[PDB]
Design a protein around this ligand. Sequence first.
Ligand code: ANP
Length: 381
Amino acid sequence: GPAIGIDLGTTYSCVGVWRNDTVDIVPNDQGNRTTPSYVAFTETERLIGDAAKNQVARNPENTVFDAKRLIGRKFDDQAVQSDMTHWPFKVVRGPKDKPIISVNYLGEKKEFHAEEISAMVLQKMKEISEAYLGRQIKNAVVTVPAYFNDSQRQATKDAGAIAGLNVMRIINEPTAAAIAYGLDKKGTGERNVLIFDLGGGTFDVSLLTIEDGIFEVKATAGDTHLGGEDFDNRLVEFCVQDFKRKNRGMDLTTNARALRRLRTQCERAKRTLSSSTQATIELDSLYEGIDYSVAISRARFEELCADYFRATLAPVEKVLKDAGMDKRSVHDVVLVGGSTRIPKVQALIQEFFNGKEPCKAINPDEAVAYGAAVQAAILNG
Ligand SMILES: Nc1ncnc2c1ncn2[C@@H]1O[C@H](COP(=O)(O)OP(=O)(O)NP(=O)(O)O)[C@@H](O)[C@H]1O
């Protein structure tokens, strides 16, 4: 049958298919090409994606996200123990030091491995692809960060198997982006490719070398706690303080629904600021019947995340140093991840590369899935 390519992201997942000998990115039920990597359990149903993410404030203990931060890892890992302190869902020690997510589902305590949560997200990707292609799908290529170990790779493959997918190969995310642009066919000799990947929760910089279609990850650097979510946090913080001074120090964070309405609008304001210089937040009866509105400029947003945007350049320096390579030696600079849509992030990378135009023709949050779909087709014959 036909083969698909899946980008199983920390915050958003994306699937690419083949129609008429080309790659199509599968739109979900909301017309979006990316789906939140969220699952939720209630007394009557399980919710996936947007439906799960939108009810997070109403059901925090049973809304699971960030399964990618847990997949193939051990319960006692310092990274796992640190992440657990910011999660409202319960994580316990299972046998063989395996993390167990503990929720309530259909009126009973239910346990899940991180790969069972990721399997739900992968099953949703299989469903939308089947609806889109009008046929059964099993063959897939699933991507992972280049730094993932054998345990994390195997657990991602297991998530695929639990979802009913035949995982033909687990490939690296930066390699998938390079494949998406046909960088393994661009010129003669050796090709140096830098993948600049800024998504919802993570920042990954990878330096690859290509020679005669063979890819080699030379160096990787980044921050697993730097993404679009942190930029929203800065906008949310600004609006929370602005409501305090407008309303005698009143704190809207005490009301989960009010904070969620604000956060939802900060996310949309941020997205508007990638195409417009002005964004408007206007929320009637936000907190204690008090109306809230604010005009947020692109300059203000850039000023609020000034430190974050600057900190993206250090891992670019780290990959070039680690490989003993100069920035002028890079033949292709590839923009990957939804947060690379931010004009200031684009301007900073281009300035660093002395005006060099990046590879950005493919939607940055779709490139990994696009590349995974190309690889899937090759492997499927
Ligand atoms: N037009 C836009 N302007 C600014 N940010 C955007 C825009 N569109 C999407 N984003 C951000 O893109 C992020 C999701 O990036 P995406 O690359 O889809 O996540 P991912 O694949 O799960 N990677 P990650 O979270 O790092 O592991 C969210 O924080 C969005 O707010």
